[PDB]
C-alpha cells in the first residue's frame, strides 16, 4: 500500500522520491498530500455573460 | 491538470505596434478586471520562467497550527476552600484573530481538523513541597452530552465521549477530527437568525442572536488534572493548536480591516480608523 | 503493493 | 455584429416581463454560475418540491430611491427584499425551505453633463455590524428585515447608548463595507459599476449560494445587494442634483419544500 | 522490538509539520460537498482581482470614502504630478490594504508583474489626455513629467473606453522582493500626470474624479509564509 | 537501531483510538460461538422496530402505564388537537425515552425519514375519522384542523385494520439535525385531530384510548457518537 | 502479510488506501477492522409467520 | 504500535550525522540556481593552486610585504642556504598560512605529493644558477650544498621562462602524514642554494628578489576533519 | 520508494549496501547522499587562454 | 504477500 | 519499488 511521488527539488547537493504509507482507516488522520490544483481565476477576474477580447473595446 | 507547483507562464519576446488593437484601453464598469501582462503595452524580452506559486495554494496557505484557546486547570491541596478547577471551552476559532482573519478570507470552507494540544505546569505559592508528575483528561463532549459539574464526578467516565490522557512532559497530545459540520460546508458568515419571530408569539419568544446558527455549533472540550489533590498547588494550561488539513474554501472576502469586536462582525468605537496618514503627491 | 506519481 | 448587435444593448425577458438598455456595460454572472434548480445527487428534503417558474421567475420591481450628494449608500438583502412580490412571497411564506437564484437590474440614468459612479456589489452572506457597543450580534430580526425599503450606509459609527430600550439596528459604516473590511476590497465580490459617462445600469446574475443545498429563506439571506457612491453625483454647478436609483429583481429557477400553513412574521 | 534509535527532533512539536495523527470520531458519517459556487485554488487568484487604492490618504481624507478618489480639474496644463506612489506593494500605504496588498502581508517575499488601472468618473462631456507612469528604482524619484515620461508609460485617452490599464513590468535585480520598505529590493515610481488638460463645454462640472485599481498578472507568485501586522490582539 | 524520530501524539491515550496490543492470555482455547436467535448488526436496526410513546406526561399520569394512553371520547366535533407534539426525536419528553429516542441520544446528529403508527383501542363497534398532521417548521404550530390540515398529513378512517401510520418524510434545511432542542435543526410539528368524530351505538363505552408508536425508516441514520444523558452515577 | 484496504475519502484536499500489518499471533490484539455488514431489520421488525405485503390488508 | 526497542544512541545530538528532518517552510518556492562562473566541488582544487609563501618571517619583516621577499645578490659563490624550510605544510610558520596550509589545518591528516615553484624577480639582465633541494628525514638537515645535492633536487638555470618548480614527492613511512609537528610523520628538509652565482653586467641592480610558490599535485589528499587553530573568538 | 546504494568498504570484518527512504516532500528535509563528484581544477590551476602543455616552454 | 480489499 | 546505485 505504499505511495511513491516525487519531490520538487530546490538545491541540488535523476527525479527524487519519496513515500507514504497511511497507517490509520480515516482519510482524516491522513497527513495532507500538498499535491494541489490550480485553477484559473476568471470566476473573478472575467464574471461577464459576454466572453472578453483583451485586445477588443471592452465596451462596443 | 495544472498543478500548484507548476512554473507559472514563460514571458514572450514582444516588439513594437501601431495597431487597432487596444488592450491599454478598458472599462472597469463591466465588472472585469483586464487580463494584461507585460507583452501588451511594453517591449519584452523573451524570458523562461521558473517561479510557482506552490506556497499560496489554498492547502498551503493554511498548513500551520495556529493557538485558538488557552485552557487553565489546577490541582490544590485538599484542604482548600475554593474547588479544583477543571477548565471547559466552547470549541471555535473565533476567541482568538489570526487563524479567524486568514478563514474569513473567505465565506465558506470544508476541512479536516488537526487538534494539538501544549500542556505547561507551575507552582504558585512559595512553598518548599514537590508534586508527582500529572496526568490530564481532555474530554470531548458532543452537544447534548453531560457537561461536568466537578472534577471528578461521573462524566469523566467516557464511555462514548472521545477522551485523550496526556502523561504531563511528554510529545504534545494530537488528534484528528473529520469534516464534522451539518451543513456540506462551514459557515464562516451566516447572514440570519435561527428563530423566525411570529406575530401570534411574544416578541421574547421568536428572539435570537444576529448570525448565529447552532448555540452549541460544536461542543465543549473540558480539562481535568487526573491527579488527587496534593498539599502543595499546581497550575497549569493547555495551549489548543488547530491546523486545517484537506481544505476546500468558497467565495472571497475581503479581510478584516479594524479589530475584530466578539464573535459577530461588529466594530467598536475608536477601532475604525486602520489606514495613517500619507500625500497624495508623496512617494 | 506501491502506487508511483 | 454587423448586423448592428452591442454590449451596451440588452433585452431581458423573465415571464411575462422584459426589461430593455440601450446603456449596458455588458452583464455579470456571479462566480460564472447560472442558476439552476437542485439536482437529485445534491438534494435533501424528499417531498416534491414546489417549482412556481413564471409565477414568480419575473421581474419585480422595488420602491424607486434617491440619489443625492449626500447619499452615502443603500443596501438590501434577498431573499429579504422579495419577501411581499407576488406569488414569489407567498410561495416563501408557505413553505419552511426555499432556494432561488436571482436577475438583479440596478437602473439609473442621468445626462453627459452629469458625473458619478455607483459600485453595485453582491455579497453572499452579507453579514452587517450592529450599532452598539455594550452587546455584540443584538441587531433584531425586524431591523436586519427592512423588506424591499432596504437599508442604508453611514460615514459615521454612532453607537446607541440608550441601554433601557435599544434600538437593535446596524450601523453600516461605508468605509467599512458595514461589515469591518475596507470598501476598495468589495471588487472581489460580484459587481459591476455604474459610471454615468459610461452606463445607467448594473446587471447581476446570481447563483443561490449557501453552505446547504436548500434552507429556510424566512430566517436567513443568502445575497446582500451593496450599492455605494464610489464618486459622488454631481452636475453642472448645481448645488443640490437628484437622480433616482431603481431596483428591479427577478427570481430565478426557485423551489420550495415543507408545505404547511403560512408563516406570518412579526416585521415591526 | 525493532530496534530503533530516536534521533533529533524527536517528540518536539513544529506547527508546521504534516503528519498523521489518531481520528478521535472514527467511522464518522461525513456529510458530502455540494457545487457551491466561487472555489479558490490558490490566493494568487484573489491577487489577480482589481481592488480599489485608497490614494489620498490626507488627514482629513483618510478612513473615509474620500481617501479613493483622486481629483482632477479643468485647469491649465501643468507638469505637476496629480499622484505619487511608491511600488511597495505589501507596505506603501496606499498599497498594503488592497486585496493584493493583503496578501502579500501574509507573505516575506513577492514577484512578478503588476497592473494599474484608472477609471475616469467625471461627465461624457469632459476629455483629456493622462500620462501614467512607471519609473523602475535608482534614480531622483520623477516629480516633473520630463522625468516620468523616460520611464515605462502610457499615453490615456480619455473617451467612450473609460478606464486605462499601464502594466507595472517586473524589472527586478532580486528574483524576490520583500514584503516590507527595503532599499535593496526598492520597486520604484508610479505616478500620473496631466499630458494636455481636462477639457469641458460650459454647464459642466470642471472637477472630478478618477479611481483607481491594482491587480497582479499570470506571471506574480508569494512565498515563505508568516504572520501580518494588519491585525492584532493587545490582551 | 533504525533511526526514528518521535511524533506529536506519542504516548497519549485517545480513547477511541484503533491498535494492537499484546495478549495477556496467549493459546488460550477460545470457546466457539454458537448460532444464537436475535444477532443485531447496526443499533438503527433497533431504531427500525416500533415502540409505544408515552403522550400524556401529564403530573398525574407520568411514571404510570396512564400516559401512554391518549383519551378518546364520542363528543361532537372538534377542531381542537387530540395531542401536539415536537419533532425533536431526541430531546421532546414524549420522544426521548423511546427507543428510537434512547439510540439517538448517544448519537449528536440525525437525519432520514420517521414514522408514527397510531392503534385504536376502543370497541369494534366504535367508528370514528382523525387527522394525523406533521407541520414542517417555521410558521404557528398548529392548534386547529384548518392549519394542520395545510401541511403533511393522514385522514384515519377507523375500522378493520385498527391501525394507521402516517410518514414525517425527510424535511430540512441542514443534512443532519441535533438531538438537542435547537431553533436551528427544528424539525417542526406532530398533531392529531378529530376528521369527523368518534361514533358509537348504545350499549357501548363512549370512551377510549389510542395507542402511539414511533419508528424510524431504512433511509434513517445517526452520527457523532456521544455519552447520553439518560443514565448518571453520582457518587 | 500486509493488508491493503481503501478509506472511504469524507473532506478531500483515485481510491486512497491504507495499510495494516498483524504484529501478533493471537486474533484477540488485533485492531478493530470496521468492516462491517449490515443486515436486514425483518428478525425484529417483521417477525410474522406469514409474510408482509404492505400495500395489502396486514389482517384478511 | 509496532513492537520497538529503543537502541544506545538514542536520542543523542552527534553534531557529524545525517538524518532527516521536518521541513519550517513546506512548499516554498525556491529560487532555481543560475550558471556562477567558479563553482568548487572539492576543498583540494584549492590546495592545487600556487600561493605564496612568507619565506622571511624575521622580527622586522614578518607580518609586511617584505616576508614574501627572498633576497638574492650576486656575491661570489657560496655553499651557504639561501633559505631553509621544514617539510611540515600545516605546521611549519612558512607553510602554515598559504592556502594549501590553511585548508590542511581542517584536517588532521594529508598524504600526496607537492610542488614548489620559485619565480625570479631580478633584470633580465641578470643571470644565475640556483639549486633547490628536497632531503626526506632521518639525517642532518642540508645546510651545505654538499649534503642537499645528495638528496632530491632541481637545478635551476634562469632565463626567459622565468620560473622553475621542483616537484617534492611523496616520501613517506606512513600512508598519512599528521598536519602538526611530528617526529613519527616529519617530512624532511626544503632548501634553496646558489649552484653558480648571480651574474649581472654593469648599471644593472646587484639584488633582487626570488618569490615562492606552493601548490599540491594531482595525488593529493587530506582526511579527518577538524578545527583549525587559526582562527578564534576569545570572549 | 527505496533507494539502495553501496557502501565503500574500508576496514572489512560481495558489496555491501545500505537503503535510504525518504519520508518528507520537500526535499530540504532530506539527509545528503554524500554521492559527490569531482572536478578538474583548471579553472583556478590554468585559467589562460591558450592551453598549457607541461613539456613545452610556458612562453614562447 | 499483500492482501488487497 | 526500490532504485539501486
Ligand atoms: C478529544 C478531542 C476531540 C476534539 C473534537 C472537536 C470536534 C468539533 C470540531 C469543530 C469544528 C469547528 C469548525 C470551525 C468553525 C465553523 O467553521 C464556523 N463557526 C461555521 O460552522
Ligand atoms: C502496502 O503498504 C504494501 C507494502 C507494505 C510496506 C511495509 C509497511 C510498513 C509498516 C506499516 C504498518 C501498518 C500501519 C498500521
Ligand atoms: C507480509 O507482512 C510480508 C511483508 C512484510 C512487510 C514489512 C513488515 C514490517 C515489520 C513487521 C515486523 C513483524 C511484526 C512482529
Ligand atoms: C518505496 O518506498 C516502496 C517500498 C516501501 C518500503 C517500506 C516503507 C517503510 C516505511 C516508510 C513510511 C512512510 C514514510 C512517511
Redesign the interface.
Known amino acids: 500500500g505504499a505511495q511513491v511521488s516525487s519531490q520538487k527539488v530546490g538545491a541540488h547537493e535523476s527525479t527524487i522520491n519519496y513515500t507514504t504509507i497511511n497507517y490509520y482507516r480515516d482519510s482524516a488522520s491522513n497527513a495532507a498530500s500538498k499535491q494541489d490544483f490550480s485553477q484559473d481565476p476568471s470566476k473573478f477576474t472575467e464574471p461577464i455573460k459576454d466572453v472578453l477580447i483583451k485586445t477588443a473595446p471592452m465596451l462596443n | 491538470a495544472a498543478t500548484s507547483r507548476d512554473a507559472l507562464p514563460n514571458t514572450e519576446a514582444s516588439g513594437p505596434t501601431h495597431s487597432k488593437e487596444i488592450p491599454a484601453l478598458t472599462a472597469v464598469e463591466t465588472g472585469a478586471t483586464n487580463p494584461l501582462v507585460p507583452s501588451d503595452t511594453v517591449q519584452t524580452r523573451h524570458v523562461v520562467q521558473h517561479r510557482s506559486r506552490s506556497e499560496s495554494s489554498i492547502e498551503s496557505f493554511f498548513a500551520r497550527g495556529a493557538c485558538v484557546t488557552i485552557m487553565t486547570v489546577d490541582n490544590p491541596a485538599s484542604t482548600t476552600n475554593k474547588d479544583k478547577l477543571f477548565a471547559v471551552w466552547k470549541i471555535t476559532y473565533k476567541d482568538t484573530v489570526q487563524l479567524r482573519r486568514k478563514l474569513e478570507f473567505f465565506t465558506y470552507s470544508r476541512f479536516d481538523m488537526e487538534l494539538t494540544f501544549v500542556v505547561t505546569a507551575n507552582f504558585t505559592e512559595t512553598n518548599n513541597g514537590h508534586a508527582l508528575n500529572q496526568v490530564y483528561q481532555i474530554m470531548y463532549i458532543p452537544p447534548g452530552a453531560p457537561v461536568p459539574e466537578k472534577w471528578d464526578d461521573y462524566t469523566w467516565q467516557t464511555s462514548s465521549n472521545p477522551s485523550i490522557f496526556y502523561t504531563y512532559g511528554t510529545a504534545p497530545a494530537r488528534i484528528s477530527v473529520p469534516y464534522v459540520g451539518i451543513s456540506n460546508a462551514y459557515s464562516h458568515f451566516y447572514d440570519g437568525f435561527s428563530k423566525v419571530p411570529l406575530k401570534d408569539q411574544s416578541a421574547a419568544l421568536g428572539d435570537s442572536l444576529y448570525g448565529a446558527a447552532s448555540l452549541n455549533d460544536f461542543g465543549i472540550l473540558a480539562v481535568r488534572v487526573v491527579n488527587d489533590h496534593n498539599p502543595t498547588k499546581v497550575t497549569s494550561k493547555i495551549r489548543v493548536y488547530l491546523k486545517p488539513k484537506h481544505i476546500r474554501v468558497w467565495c472571497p472576502r475581503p479581510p478584516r480591516a479594524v479589530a475584530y469586536y466578539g464573535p459577530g462582525v461588529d466594530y467598536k468605537d475608536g477601532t475604525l480608523t486602520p489606514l495613517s496618514t500619507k500625500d497624495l503627491t508623496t512617494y | 503493493g506501491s502506487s508511483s506519481t | 455584429e454587423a448586423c448592428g448587435y ?3 444593448v440588452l433585452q431581458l425577458t423573465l415571464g411575462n416581463s422584459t426589461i430593455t438598455t440601450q446603456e449596458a ?9 447560472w442558476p439552476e434548480y437542485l439536482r437529485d445527487s ?1 438534494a ?4 416534491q418540491p414546489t417549482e412556481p417558474d413564471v409565477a414568480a421567475c419575473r421581474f419585480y420591481t422595488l420602491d424607486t430611491v434617491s440619489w443625492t450628494k449626500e447619499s ?1 449608500g443603500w443596501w438590501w ?1 434577498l431573499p429579504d427584499a422579495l419577501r411581499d412580490m407576488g406569488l414569489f412571497g407567498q410561495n416563501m ?1 408557505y ?3 426555499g432556494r432561488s437564484g436571482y436577475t438583479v437590474h440596478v437602473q439609473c440614468n442621468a445626462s ?6 455607483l459600485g453595485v456589489f453582491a455579497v ?7 450599532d ?2 455594550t452587546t ?7 431591523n ?1 428585515n427592512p423588506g424591499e425599503k432596504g437599508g442604508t450606509f453611514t ?1 459615521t ?1 454612532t ?1 446607541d447608548n440608550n441601554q433601557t430600550s435599544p434600538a437593535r439596528r446596524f450601523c453600516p ?5 458595514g ?21 445607467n445600469c448594473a446587471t ?2 446570481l ?1 443561490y ?8 429563506m ?5 445575497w ?1 445587494i451593496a450599492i ?5 453625483l ?4 448645481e448645488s443640490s442634483p437628484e437622480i433616482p436609483i431603481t431596483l428591479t429583481i427577478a427570481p430565478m429557477c426557485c423551489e420550495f ?10 416585521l415591526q | 522490538g525493532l530496534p530503533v534509535m530516536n534521533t533529533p527532533g524527536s517528540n518536539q512539536y513544529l506547527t508546521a509539520d504534516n503528519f498523521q495523527s489518531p481520528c478521535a470520531l472514527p467511522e464518522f458519517d461525513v456529510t458530502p460537498p455540494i457545487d457551491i459556487p466561487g472555489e479558490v485554488k490558490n490566493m494568487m487568484e484573489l491577487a489577480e482581482i482589481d481592488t480599489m487604492i485608497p490614494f489620498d490618504l490626507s488627514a482629513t481624507k483618510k478612513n473615509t470614502m474620500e481617501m479613493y478618489r483622486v481629483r482632477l480639474s479643468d485647469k491649465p496644463h501643468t507638469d505637476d504630478p496629480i499622484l505619487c506612489l511608491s511600488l511597495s506593494p505589501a507596505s506603501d500605504p496606499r498599497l498594503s490594504h488592497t486585496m493584493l496588498g493583503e496578501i502579500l502581508n501574509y507573505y516575506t517575499h513577492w514577484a512578478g508583474s503588476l497592473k494599474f488601472t484608472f477609471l475616469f468618473c467625471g461627465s461624457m462631456m469632459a476629455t483629456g489626455k493622462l500620462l501614467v507612469s512607471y519609473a523602475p528604482p535608482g534614480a531622483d524619484p520623477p516629480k516633473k513629467r520630463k522625468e516620468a515620461m523616460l520611464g515605462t508609460h502610457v499615453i490615456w485617452d480619455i473617451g467612450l473606453q473609460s478606464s486605462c490599464t499601464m502594466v507595472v513590468p517586473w524589472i527586478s535585480n532580486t528574483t524576490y522582493r520583500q514584503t516590507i520598505d527595503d532599499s535593496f529590493t526598492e520597486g520604484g515610481y508610479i505616478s500620473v500626470f496631466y499630458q494636455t488638460r481636462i477639457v469641458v463645454p460650459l454647464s459642466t462640472p470642471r472637477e472630478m474624479d478618477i479611481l483607481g485599481f491594482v491587480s497582479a498578472c499570470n506571471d506574480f507568485s508569494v512565498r515563505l509564509l508568516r504572520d501580518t501586522t494588519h491585525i492584532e490582539q493587545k490582551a
Open positions: 452591442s454590449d451596451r456595460a455588458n452583464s455579470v454572472v456571479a462566480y460564472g454560475r445534491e435533501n428534503p424528499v417531498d452615502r438583502k411564506y413553505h419552511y425551505l453627459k453633463f452629469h458625473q458619478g459612479a453572499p452572506e452579507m453579514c452587517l455590524a450592529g452598539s457597543n455584540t450580534m443584538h441587531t433584531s430580526y425586524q436586519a460615514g459609527f453607537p459604516v461605508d468605509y467599512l463595507l461589515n469591518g473590511t475596507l470598501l476598495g476590497n468589495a471588487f472581489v465580490f460580484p459587481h459591476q459599476i455604474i459610471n454615468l459617462r459610461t452606463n447581476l446574475v447563483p449560494v449557501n453552505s446547504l443545498s436548500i434552507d429556510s424566512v430566517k436567513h439571506n443568502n446582500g455605494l457612491p464610489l464618486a459622488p454631481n452636475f453642472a454647478s419544500n415543507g408545505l404547511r400553513n403560512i408563516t406570518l412574521p412579526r
